[PDB]
Design a protein around this ligand. Structure first.
Ligand SMILES: [Zn+2]
Ligand SMILES: [Zn+2]
Ligand SMILES: [Zn+2]
Lengths: 108, 98, 65, 144, 124, 81, 323
RNA sequence: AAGUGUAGUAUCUGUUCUUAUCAGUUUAAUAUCUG
RNA sequence: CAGAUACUAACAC
């Protein structure tokens, strides 16, 4: 999942993931874990390491995403859309979770 | 007691001032901005700024002066050489060349 | 005198700057936004930025003179 | 309420600070301190800064009552005009050749440091690197 | 093992800031660097003077304290009642004096030595 | 000389003569932050005694507004000893 | 909010006036460009085969072929961390109405875009040019750089495409670019320069060497230029046309670690700093902008701006706008 | 006839020291102290 | 170094 400032497991079987930057996530914990299980008891050579394959979500199901603007790095208030009410053009995120986000006063 | 108080027991020397001996801490400090030091300054072709206050020795004043000159020259803007022009086809030239 | 950070007539350059650097890194660890700034600039995880700052606390200016 | 009356009394305090008599200077310093502590967060930095110009020359005073009053004024002024100013006044005397200057300056610096350690981080001047020592705070020079 | 003044003057970016006593510091190179900083204030000139601060200010007759004009025009200078005028002096007529800039310290001899602004208040 | 140890849950007191006074600076003006004292200063025979002078203590001691503004309330136990 | 994905951390953008397209510069440290990521992956696949000597080479070739085709999304799995001093950077032109990329320029590995401008030049009149300021091989801590470049593109097809024109080398990071009187100001480390367009390179026509430290930003009104120093806050510079000179005429009396600046009026600047503060600095009335014996005041300019507003916001502010 | 004590400053009064030629203790420097 | 005088600390009684 995205890099987390904090993770919290709810007794109801959800994982909240407060992202370091960008949106936060609530995942339902669908399963508690064929995947190889590593151990301190396994013999391992000097300078060697255990290896695993990353893949798409398997124990977690995304249920909610909390739209967050952190970090805002560059903002520009302008009416680029001709709506007679300027929109806030914000360059948010960090790394590959960066975005340009257009903000407009009102309900979706 | 006043002789020792005014520091007149000490006796500083200034070459730029033609090896004059002021005989006082305060005397010395005032002299750099007075007539004899300034004459030596004129004789050596150095302006008598705060840079040269407390400098007594000719080779020092001369070398420090040279350093200051270069510094100021490299701190300034020289459009005669530091402006860029194109003669034709994007060939970059000086202001004098253009 | 008792307060760590205070100086006196015999404080060296090195001692004073090591104070400034240890005090700066603590400020960085506390001010979440200043930490945000550094993490984004370095393209690095906050946890690693904090860890790197803690590592730097040991000898922030190189060895004493 | 002092904000309303600070400008009116500023010339009088300036006159007392300029006075040869130590007690005028000592008493004016006490005024300064109290008025600075009362006008904190209400502008009026300009008057307090101007008065700091008159008060600061008295840091070399040896009389116990006068020095205590001057120190008290400085502590008050640290809150009112900010630790940044106080640091700016103390910088040149911290590594001054004379021990007497250094003793006073470190005493004032220590009061600012204990009072405003966190604030000072922003105000510390750039110290260039030595051959064997790194003194530049690189992170603060990062551009985003 | 100290630098000469001559030597220190060449080792630094701003020679004019170097004084005669600087070479006798623990760290003269740091001292001169600190003196060169933007907005730093000099040490009071009298640190090395034998006479104590302001103690040579003697032998000169000076007039009594000049009241600010708004207080002067209240007329109390002539009285030694009109409480509305007494209020107006501080709350209408009060004008800021010639306040000194940051870092310009006092010493014995000093005494005798579209253009429209944004976010301005509307007129009352 | 102030004790300057870690302030506890115990509350500082003032005798009748020393009442109204800020402990740190003797001002009678604007009492603000309630004084806290270290346990050892509150202990046994010292229970309820005056922070300034060790008298019977009848009122709650305070730091004044100026001392509060300056964070002088934070230095630790201000019992003069 | 509507969200339009980007590839790297966006440092700045500007709006093309005649089409409302956004020219966005995005830049990450510790990052591979697409080209470098491809090359690294190719050699990893080759090395993965070369690791095998026996008939295991058939399996190794299958694993290598699989690995070359696996494409875990960076937005989910994280972008791969290149080492210290490694940069990836792009210049993107996106339509703000729906976030389609109209054009995408990828810069070379270890080039980091730090500034961008859109402007006309008076010598050519009508054409629009995007100038992007780039650092080469910048090392953050300790700070060191292999110089920089200003890339010039003309912006064409009604604001939709970046036609590369020329790349101009500079001695230090061109950290700020500001269109100015039909030319452009560029803050190259501590140096403030006026550049004209030329043909083969941008041409330096004026310079000032007296800014204290690294220039973090530039703003202008009329003949006035407001320079953000990284630490020494605001310096007011006047350009003089006939003399062809940039003169410092005022500065602040406090260090501020400026992050952003907005001009409020002809005499007033709002600043933000790295320490979560906003301030407003104003030139006092009858400040004169028409300007070894000179020393200035307190080792700075002869005239001082006055802080008319200070406020600790609590969070680091990277943008300010009067609107 | 509104007195005395504690802690600390300031200002007149009456004392404020001829040395060669160097070293040391010192100090920002001088002076001081010791050869 | 002594005497005289003036003063400071909402000093104390
Ligand atoms: Zn001379
Ligand atoms: Zn009591
Ligand atoms: Zn108090």
């Amino acid at each position: 999942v995205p890099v987390a400032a904090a993770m919290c497991v709810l007794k109801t079987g959800f994982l909240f993931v407060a992202s370091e930057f960008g949106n936060h996530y609530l995942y339902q914990i669908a399963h508690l874990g064929e995947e190889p299980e590593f151990s301190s008891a396994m013999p391992l050579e000097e300078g060697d390491t255990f290896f695993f394959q990353p893949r798409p979500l398997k124990n977690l199901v995304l249920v909610d995403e909390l739209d967050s603007l952190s970090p805002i790095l560059f903002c520009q208030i302008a009416d680029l859309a001709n709506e007679d009410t300027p929109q806030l053009y914000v360059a948010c995120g960090r790394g590959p979770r960066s975005s340009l986000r257009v903000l407009r006063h009102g309900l979706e | 007691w006043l002789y020792k108080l005014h520091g007149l027991n000490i006796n500083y020397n200034c070459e730029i001032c033609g090896n004059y001996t002021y005989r006082g801490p305060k005397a010395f400090q005032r002299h750099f901005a007075e007539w004899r030091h300034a004459h030596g300054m004129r004789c050596l072709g150095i302006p008598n700024t705060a840079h040269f206050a407390n400098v007594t020795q000719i080779e020092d004043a001369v070398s420090l002066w040279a350093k200051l000159k270069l510094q100021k020259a490299s701190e300034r803007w020289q459009p005669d050489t530091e402006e860029e022009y194109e003669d034709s086809s994007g060939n970059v030239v000086n202001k004098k060349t253009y | 005198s008792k307060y760590i950070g205070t100086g006196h007539a015999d404080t060296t350059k090195w001692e004073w700057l090591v104070n400034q650097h240890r005090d700066s890194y603590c400020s960085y660890m506390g001010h979440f936004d200043l930490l945000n700034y550094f993490a984004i600039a370095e393209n690095e995880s906050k946890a690693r930025v904090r860890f790197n700052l803690m590592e730097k606390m040991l000898q922030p200016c190189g060895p004493p003179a | 309420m002092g904000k309303d009356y600070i400008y009116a009394v500023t010339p009088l305090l300036e006159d007392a600070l300029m006075d040869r008599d130590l007690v005028h200077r000592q008493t004016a310093s006490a005024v300064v301190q109290h008025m600075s502590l009362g006008v904190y967060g209400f502008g009026c930095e300009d008057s307090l800064n101007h008065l700091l110009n008159y008060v600061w020359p008295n840091v070399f005073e040896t009389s116990p009552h006068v020095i205590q009053a001057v120190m008290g004024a400085l502590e008050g002024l640290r809150v009112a005009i900010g630790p940044c100013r106080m640091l700016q006044y103390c910088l040149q005397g911290l590594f001054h050749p004379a021990r007497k200057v250094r003793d006073v300056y470190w005493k004032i610096y220590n009061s600012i440091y204990i009072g405003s350690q966190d604030a000072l981080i922003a105000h510390y001047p750039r110290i260039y690197n030595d051959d064997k020592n790194t003194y530049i705070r690189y992170e603060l020079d990062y551009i985003l | 093992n100290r630098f000469t003044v001559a030597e220190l003057k060449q080792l630094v970016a701003r020679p004019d800031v170097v004084e005669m006593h600087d070479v006798t510091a623990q760290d003269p190179k740091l001292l001169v660097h600190l003196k060169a900083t933007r907005n730093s204030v000099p040490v009071p000139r009298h640190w090395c003077f034998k006479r104590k601060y302001l103690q040579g200010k003697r032998g000169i007759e000076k007039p009594p304290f000049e009241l600010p004009d708004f207080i002067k025009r209240t007329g109390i200078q002539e009285m030694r009642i009109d409480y509305q005028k007494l209020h107006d002096a501080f709350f209408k007529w009060q004008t800021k004096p010639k306040l000194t800039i940051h870092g310009d310290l006092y010493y014995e001899g000093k005494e005798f030595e579209d253009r429209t602004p944004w976010g301005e208040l509307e007129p009352s | 000389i102030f004790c300057r140890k870690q302030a506890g849950v115990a509350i500082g007191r003032l005798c009748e003569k020393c009442d109204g006074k800020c402990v740190i600076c003797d001002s009678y003006v604007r009492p603000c932050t309630l004084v806290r004292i270290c346990d050892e200063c509150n202990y046994g025979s010292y229970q309820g005694r005056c922070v300034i002078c060790g008298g019977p203590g009848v009122s709650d001691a305070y730091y004044c507004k100026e001392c509060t503004i300056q964070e002088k309330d934070r230095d630790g136990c201000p019992k003069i000893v | 909010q509507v969200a339009f994905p980007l590839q790297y951390t966006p440092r700045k953008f500007v709006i093309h006036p005649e089409s409302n397209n956004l020219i966005i510069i995005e830049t990450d440290h510790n990052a591979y460009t697409e080209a470098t990521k491809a090359q690294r992956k190719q050699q990893m696949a080759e090395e993965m085969v070369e690791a095998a000597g026996e008939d295991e080479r058939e399996l190794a070739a299958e694993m290598a072929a699989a690995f070359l085709n696996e494409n875990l999304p960076e937005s989910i799995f994280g972008a791969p961390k290149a080492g210290n001093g490694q940069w990836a950077s792009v210049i993107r032109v996106m339509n703000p109405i729906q976030g389609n990329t109209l054009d995408l320029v990828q810069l070379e590995q270890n080039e980091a875009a730090f500034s961008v401008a859109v402007c006309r030049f008076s010598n050519t009149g009508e054409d629009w040019y995007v100038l992007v300021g780039v650092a080469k091989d910048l090392i953050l801590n300790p700070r060191s750089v292999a110089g920089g470049f200003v890339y010039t593109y003309k912006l064409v097809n009604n604001g939709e495409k970046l036609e590369f024109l020329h790349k101009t080398p500079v001695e230090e990071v061109p950290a700020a670019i500001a269109p100015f009187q039909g030319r452009v100001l560029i803050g190259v480390g501590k140096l403030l320069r006026v550049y004209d367009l030329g043909k083969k390179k941008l041409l330096r026509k004026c310079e000032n060497k007296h800014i204290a430290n690294y220039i973090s930003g530039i703003q202008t009104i009329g003949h006035r230029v407001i320079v953000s120093d990284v630490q020494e806050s605001f310096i007011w510079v006047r350009y003089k046309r006939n003399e062809n000179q940039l003169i410092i005429f005022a500065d602040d009396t406090y260090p501020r670690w400026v992050t952003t600046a907005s001009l409020l009026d002809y005499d007033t600047v709002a600043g933000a700093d790295k320490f979560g503060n906003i301030c407003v600095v104003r030139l006092p009335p009858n400040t004169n902008d028409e300007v070894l014996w000179d020393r200035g005041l307190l080792n700075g300019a002869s005239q001082k701006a006055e802080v008319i507003m200070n406020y600790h916001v609590g969070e680091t502010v990277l943008s300010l706008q009067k609107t």
